[PDB]
A paper describes a structure:
Like other CoVs, SARS-CoV-2 infection requires membrane fusion between viral envelope and cell membrane, which is mediated by viral trimeric spike (S) glycoprotein. As illustrated in Figure 1(A), each S protein is subdivided into a receptor-binding S1 subunit and a fusogenic S2 subunit that are delimited by a furin cleavage site (S1/S2), and the S2 contains a second protease cleavage site (S2′) at N-terminus, followed by fusion peptide (FP), heptad repeat-1 domain (HR1), heptad repeat-2 domain (HR2), membrane-proximal external region (MPER), transmembrane domain (TM), and a cytoplasmic tail (CT). Peptides derived from HR2 sequences of viral fusion proteins, including the S protein of emerging CoVs, can competitively bind to the HR1 domain and block the formation of the viral 6-HB core, thereby inhibiting infection of the virus from which they were derived.
We could build most of the residues of the peptides in the electron density map, but it was disappointed that the C-terminal MPER amino acids of IPB19 could not be located in the electron density map, reflecting flexibility of this region.
Numbering used by the authors:
A (entry chain B), C (entry chain B), F (entry chain B): 1175 to 1201
B (entry chain A), D (entry chain A), E (entry chain A): 908 to 957
């Protein structure tokens, strides 16, 4: 049997990037 | 004067809270995705072992 | 050999839910 | 008056810090659980390959 | 007096923001590591199935 | 085939620990 977890992987990489938008701007 | 400074501090707090809540929501999604991927792997590893 | 990671999965889903209690209430 | 407003802002900061610290503790637990699950999967995948 | 208290509150906000940003950076790294590990597992599980 | 994800596991455990340094000190 094969496993398909690509949607989960894609989402983790997406959040790893878009957490940049949650950073607090010191300036 | 002081009321302007009070409001600057209050607006900062609202920004901190909104950014924090946004990050927590994204982290919650990430934890559900991690759990989902791990369960799928557990299932297939065990199916192939059997 | 079989793998048993259900306790870890359960914990991840539990935290995904109970992080709701760590949210900052704007009101 | 201003001292009431100062205290409102300070209590908000204590709330922000306590909620943040609570979330970090839960996230730390989640990372340890993720690492634990991944190591168990690595071990069994490799055992079955061998 | 009030300006001292205003500055105490402002320094607290800068601390909260810096600690939060630091934590988010570490969590981002952790999510990339989780995704990387999951993709490696998916690949090998499927290779061994085939 | 074998899988090698030890660097990822090490990093997750490292961050799980060093997030202690990101905590807000109430005192």
């Amino acid at each position: 049997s094969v496993v398909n977890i690509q949607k989960e992987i894609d989402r983790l990489n997406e959040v790893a990037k878009n957490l940049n938008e949650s950073l607090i701007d010191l300036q | 004067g002081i009321g302007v400074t009070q409001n600057v501090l209050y607006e900062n707090q609202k920004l901190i809270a909104n950014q924090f809540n946004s990050a927590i929501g994204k982290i919650q999604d990430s934890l559900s995705s991690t759990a989902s991927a791990l369960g799928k792997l557990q299932d297939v590893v065990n199916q192939n072992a059997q």
